[PDB]
RNA sequence: GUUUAUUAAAAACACAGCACUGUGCAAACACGAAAGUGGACGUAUACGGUGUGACGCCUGCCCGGUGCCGGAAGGUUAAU
RNA sequence: UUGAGCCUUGAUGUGUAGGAUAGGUGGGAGGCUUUGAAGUGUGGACGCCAGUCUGCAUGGAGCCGACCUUGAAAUACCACCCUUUAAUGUUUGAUGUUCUAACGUUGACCCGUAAUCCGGGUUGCGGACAGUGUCUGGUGGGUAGUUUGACUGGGGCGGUC
């Protein structure tokens, strides 16, 4: 038969292709342990609706889990009111829920665990930097400036 | 039986084999089985070895 | 009885024609095989005595559709 | 390629040595492997041959100017017949036989042209072009073609040399072109 | 194919004929030749000459693994018994140790009877 | 011992014994379109078939023919 | 993995007069090797142990042609290849390796169920074999239906048509 697959399936499958398999394999193994299904045409278009949706649509929505950072370099500077000891060296210090909570709390809304401050930003005063995370490949840089007020 | 000769010489040197096996017990064990006839063979083999 | 539950196939009578053309009553049995089909929609195996043509029909129509046909004519399974 | 690559001759002196060896079929039933009266081929080729004829002491004044050089006289039939070292080729047709001076004990000579009205008449071309190619072992074809001064112009010996496919026997398959020589080898299909 | 260099010469030497096989140190057969197969048949092959040419055709067949040195194991009485280990020295083999392996029953089977010739 | 109930009781059948041959058990074999059975709640010192016919002394020669068993290199050879 | 096709790629020839272990015709009077040779020294190796080929290598720079003979002339070079053989593939199986999931179970167990049937279930052993359907070649007095002439000094035998 033809049959269209479900899971990845070894030396033939893919995850949702239209392979062609010996019926002995389809009945008796694949379809029963639902790893595939009869290509009843009714189905093959059940799959064409499934060829437009999740893919074409929700990847220009990860073009929004990405263009969040088109507003990461268009400000590129938050200040933290953290002072300085005996020579412009932070009396404060700023981490991730400091650089995600002092990022969210404006027009820059990020998820608190989306702010990568290398053992840095907060340790001393002045300008620093950080690695802001929204996508797996597209993050983005800013500049942080712990203001000693 | 065994000779594991060493360095400088290509000659056999296996004079050993005429001091033990070979035809000794090989022409012997070869043919007929003998029996009580070796008694007569080994009797003449001693009437000799007196003188 | 050598009868396919899907299609009705059962033995049929015909002739054996010799080379001399002698007829002889014979039968033609169907290719019956009892077979365990997994019915997902009932969390159960249902074994049927079917002809291979039968299997082919179950493969196309779909077991759930075929079982329904039997249920329809009060055929048990 | 589809037809023939005559650019596939591409370090001798000249590649006139590119022989036409197009396969033929076996002997299933009864069939032969015959070459016509000097297969010319629709390419002049440019070959100034040497055609030795069994003509007479009359046709030495025009039967020597038509794609040849000389002709063997009537006195030189057996007056030059006592030396294996001192002695295409021709043999006039009809009631003329060639076994009293060309049949003893091993060459290839048969056809040239039979003419009693003209030794070289206005239009009778076909000789000073190509030779022949008869049976050898398990096949035939053995000849020659084109040169180094050719291109897809001497590829008229592919649509008028592989077109020399004659009647086969029964349970045979004559079709396998192959040329070239004194450089490389090969050919495509037929 | 293959390569060994350290081998063993086996020679079967029986009144009727003698056969030579060169094998490796595990006893896996490499090459063999036989007095009766080198020509000469009958009283012919029953000679030390025949056994000689038999260590020869053999050397031209076992050098086909590049053997350099080999032990000798002699079995049987019979011509070619030692005439055949002379052929092996000369043919350009180093020759390590010699041995006799002709089997000696502690009186088992009853050997054949006859030979009223 | 058995047998032709009703023209044959015998030298015919059987018989213990012998031999050959098949059978590893869902045995071979047999009743059965099948299911189910017998063989057997047995298992090769067992079961089937076949001939011979207590016992004594013995049982030679022939494998061309037919039958059976084995073999595969080639040859020929079905549906397809 | 292996038996057959089929496609490239390499082998090799002791009929006689002879410079000599000439395969058949065909191109064919200079190709070649410093893109590193002849001939020595071995390697794998074919085999009528007659001898050949070659990757490696010591090597270090020319061989040839109608040459007159031979029914047929060049290891001068190249071809389509025959004698027979050999190596990858392409394809077709077939034989051979495992798996489990179809299927087999005349192993053990659970339930329906106080049941040596059956069904379902679990587990063990098998396992794409086995077996069955259709088609097909072989076997097939076990069974079946039949045939197995006439003339004739009765019929049969012989003879005859
Ligand atoms: Mg009585
Ligand atoms: Mg009575
Ligand atoms: Mg009555
Ligand atoms: Mg009475
Ligand atoms: Mg019995
Ligand atoms: Mg009797
Ligand atoms: Mg009967
Ligand atoms: Mg009958
Ligand atoms: Mg009558």
Curated annotation (Swiss-Prot), chain A:
Keywords: Acetylation, Ribonucleoprotein, Ribosomal protein, RNA-binding, rRNA-binding. Pfam families: Ribosomal_L9_C (PF03948), Ribosomal_L9_N (PF01281). It comes from the Bacteria. Signal peptide: none annotated. Transmembrane segments: none annotated. One of its GO terms (cellular component) is cytosolic large ribosomal subunit. The modification N6-succinyllysine is found at residues 71, 83, 112. The modification N6-acetyllysine is found at residue 89. PROSITE patterns: RIBOSOMAL_L9. GO terms for molecular function: large ribosomal subunit rRNA binding; structural constituent of ribosome. InterPro entries: Ribosomal_bL9, Ribosomal_bL9/RNase_H1_N, Ribosomal_bL9_bac/chp, Ribosomal_bL9_C, Ribosomal_bL9_C_sf, Ribosomal_bL9_N, Ribosomal_bL9_N_sf. GO terms for biological process: cytoplasmic translation. Part of the 50S ribosomal subunit. In stalled/collided disomes (pairs of ribosomes where the leading ribosome is stalled and a second ribosome has collided with it) bL9 in the collided ribosome contacts bS6 and uL2, while it contacts only helices of the 16S rRNA in the stalled ribosome; the inter-ribosome bridge thus formed is different from that formed between normally translating ribosomes. Belongs to the bacterial ribosomal protein bL9 family. One of the primary rRNA binding proteins, it binds very close to the 3' end of the 23S rRNA. HAMAP family: Ribosomal_bL9 (MF_00503). This is Large ribosomal subunit protein bL9. It comes from Escherichia coli (strain K12). The gene is rplI.
UniProtKB/Swiss-Prot annotation, chain C:
Keywords: Ribonucleoprotein, Ribosomal protein, RNA-binding, rRNA-binding. InterPro entries: Ribosomal_bL28, Ribosomal_bL28/bL31-like_sf, Ribosomal_bL28_bact-type, Ribosomal_bL28_sf. Coiled coil: none annotated. One of its GO terms (biological process) is cytoplasmic translation. One of its GO terms (molecular function) is structural constituent of ribosome. SUPFAM superfamilies: L28p-like. GO terms for cellular component: cytoplasm; cytosol; cytosolic large ribosomal subunit. NCBIfam families: L28 (TIGR00009). HAMAP family: Ribosomal_bL28 (MF_00373). Part of the 50S ribosomal subunit. Belongs to the bacterial ribosomal protein bL28 family. This is Large ribosomal subunit protein bL28. It comes from Escherichia coli (strain K12). The gene is rpmB.
From Swiss-Prot, chain D:
Coiled coil: none annotated. Gene3D superfamilies: 3.30.190.20, 3.40.50.790. One of its GO terms (cellular component) is large ribosomal subunit. One of its GO terms (molecular function) is rRNA binding. Keywords: Repressor, Ribonucleoprotein, Ribosomal protein, RNA-binding, rRNA-binding, Translation regulation, tRNA-binding. Transmembrane segments: none annotated. One of its GO terms (biological process) is translation. It holds the Pfam family Ribosomal_L1. Part of the 50S ribosomal subunit. Directly binds to 23S rRNA. Forms what is known as the L1 stalk, which protrudes beyond the 70S ribosome surface. The stalk is preferentially stabilized in 70S versus 50S crystals. Interacts with the E site tRNA, blocking the exit path. This blockage implies that this section of the ribosome must be able to move to release the deacetylated tRNA. Protein L1 is also a translational repressor protein, it controls the translation of the L11 operon by binding to its mRNA. NCBIfam families: rplA_bact (TIGR01169). PANTHER family: 54S RIBOSOMAL PROTEIN L1, MITOCHONDRIAL (PTHR36427), LARGE RIBOSOMAL SUBUNIT PROTEIN UL1M (PTHR36427:SF3). Belongs to the universal ribosomal protein uL1 family. This is Large ribosomal subunit protein uL1.
From Swiss-Prot, chain E:
Keywords: Methylation, Ribonucleoprotein, Ribosomal protein, RNA-binding, rRNA-binding. Disulfide bonds: none annotated. GO terms for molecular function: small ribosomal subunit rRNA binding; structural constituent of ribosome. PROSITE patterns: RIBOSOMAL_S11. InterPro entries: Ribosomal_uS11, Ribosomal_uS11_bac-type, Ribosomal_uS11_CS, Ribosomal_uS11_sf. One of its GO terms (biological process) is cytoplasmic translation. One of its GO terms (cellular component) is cytoplasm. Belongs to the universal ribosomal protein uS11 family. Has been predicted to contact the N-terminal domain of IF-3 based on footprint studies; exactly how IF-3 interacts with the 30S subunit is controversial. Part of the 30S ribosomal subunit. Interacts with proteins uS7 and bS18. Cross-links to IF-3. In stalled ribosomes contacts ribosome rescue factor SmrB. Located on the platform of the 30S subunit, it bridges several disparate RNA helices of the 16S rRNA. Forms part of the Shine-Dalgarno cleft in the 70S ribosome. This is Small ribosomal subunit protein uS11. It comes from Escherichia coli (strain K12). The lineage of its organism: Bacteria, Pseudomonadati, Pseudomonadota, Gammaproteobacteria, Enterobacterales. The gene is rpsK.
């Amino acid at each position: 038969m033809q049959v269209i697959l479900l899971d990845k399936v070894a030396n033939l499958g893919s995850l949702g292709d239209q392979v062609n398999v010996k019926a002995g394999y389809a009945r008796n193994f694949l379809v029963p342990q639902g790893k595939a299904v009869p290509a009843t045409k009714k189905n093959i278009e059940f799959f064409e609706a499934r060829r437009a949706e999740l893919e074409a649509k929700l990847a220009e929505v990860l073009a929004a889990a990405n263009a969040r950072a088109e507003k990461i370099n268009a400000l590129e500077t938050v200040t933290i009111a953290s002072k300085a000891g005996d020579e412009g060296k932070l009396f404060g210090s700023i981490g991730t829920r400091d650089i995600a909570d002092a990022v969210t709390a404006a027009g820059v809304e990020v998820a608190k665990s989306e702010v990568r401050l290398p053992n840095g930003v907060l340790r001393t005063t002045g300008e620093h930097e950080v690695s802001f995370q929204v996508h797996s490949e597209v993050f983005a840089k800013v500049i942080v400036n712990v203001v000693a007020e | 039986i065994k000779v594991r000769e060493n360095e400088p010489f290509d000659v056999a040197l296996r004079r050993f084999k005429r001091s033990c096996e070979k035809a000794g017990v090989l022409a012997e064990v070869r043919r007929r089985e003998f029996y009580e006839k070796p008694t007569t063979e080994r009797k003449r083999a001693k009437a000799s070895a007196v003188k | 009885s050598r009868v396919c539950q899907v299609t009705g196939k059962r033995p049929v009578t015909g002739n054996n024609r010799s080379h001399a053309l002698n007829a002889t009553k014979r039968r033609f049995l169907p290719n019956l095989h009892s077979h365990r089909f997994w019915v997902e929609s009932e969390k159960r195996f249902v074994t049927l005595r079917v002809s291979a043509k039968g299997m082919r029909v179950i493969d196309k129509k779909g077991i759930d559709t075929v079982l329904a046909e039997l249920r329809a004519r009060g055929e048990k399974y | 390629k589809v037809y023939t690559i005559d650019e596939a001759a591409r370090t001798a002196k000249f590649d006139e040595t590119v022989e036409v060896h197009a396969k033929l079929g076996i002997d299933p039933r009864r069939s032969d492997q015959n070459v016509r009266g000097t297969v010319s081929l629709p390419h002049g080729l440019g070959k100034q041959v040497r055609v030795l004829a069994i003509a007479k002491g009359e046709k030495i004044k025009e039967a020597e100017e038509a794609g040849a050089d000389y002709v063997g006289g009537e006195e030189i039939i057996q007056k030059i017949l006592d030396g294996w070292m001192d002695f295409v080729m021709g043999a006039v047709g009809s009631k003329l036989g060639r076994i009293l001076g060309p049949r003893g004990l091993n060459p290839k000579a048969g056809t040239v042209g039979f003419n009693i009205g003209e030794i070289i008449r206005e239009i009778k071309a076909g000789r000073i072009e190509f030779r022949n190619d008869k049976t050898g072992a398990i096949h035939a074809p053995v000849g020659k073609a084109s040169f180094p001064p050719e291109k897809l112009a001497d590829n008229i010996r592919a649509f008028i040399r592989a077109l020399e496919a004659h009647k086969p026997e029964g349970a045979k398959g004559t079709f396998l072109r192959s040329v070239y020589v004194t450089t490389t080898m090969g050919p495509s299909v037929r | 194919r293959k390569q060994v260099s350290d081998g063993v010469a086996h020679i079967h030497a029986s009144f009727n004929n003698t056969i030579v096989t060169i094998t490796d140190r595990q006893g896996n057969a490499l090459g063999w030749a036989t007095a009766g197969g080198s020509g000469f048949r009958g009283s012919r092959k029953s000679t030390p000459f025949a056994a000689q040419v038999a260590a020869e055709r053999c050397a031209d067949a076992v050098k086909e693994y590049g053997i350099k040195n080999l032990e000798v194991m002699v079995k049987g009485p019979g011509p070619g018994r030692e005439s055949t280990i002379r052929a092996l020295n000369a043919a350009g083999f180093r020759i390590t140790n010699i041995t006799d392996v002709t089997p000696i029953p502690h009186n088992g089977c009853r050997p054949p009877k006859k030979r009223r010739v």
